[PDB]
């Protein structure tokens, strides 16, 4: 009604917020210890990933969160 | 696919990795700001819905993240 707008404005506001350098620095920094905890076998692979799309992950994944989907969640849609 | 694995453990980390204290207090320090973004007609409610829901915004946020879609994306999946 008016209570879904406000609330999917404000999980908008929020998802733009995250997606900051402070963010990515984070991410970036923790891409070594995200791969050594993987079965040696897959190391190769998850390096070759990650020095190909490791930087464009963050800005995916907040793309895709739907507003109306967490306020459903929240009960307000 | 391993690559698929790959990329679908790589989300999973990332969403663990940005659900902490660091990403919560921003957000909460800056609800404030984002109400006020909003017509004077709104503001009660814009408080009301930060004062009830404004902590678990990120929470559901990042439980709704689907680490095969942000791969299929990256066409690393399907």
Do not use: R, W
């Amino acid at each position: 009604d008016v209570y879904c707008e406000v609330c999917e404005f404000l999980v908008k506001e929020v998802t733009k917020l995250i997606d900051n350098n402070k963010t990515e620095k984070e991410i970036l920094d923790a891409f070594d210890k995200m791969c050594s905890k993987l079965p040696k076998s897959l190391s190769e692979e998850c390096q070759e990933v990650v020095d190909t799309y490791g930087s464009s992950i963050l800005s995916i994944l907040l793309e895709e969160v739907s507003p109306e989907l967490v306020c459903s969640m929240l009960h307000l849609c």
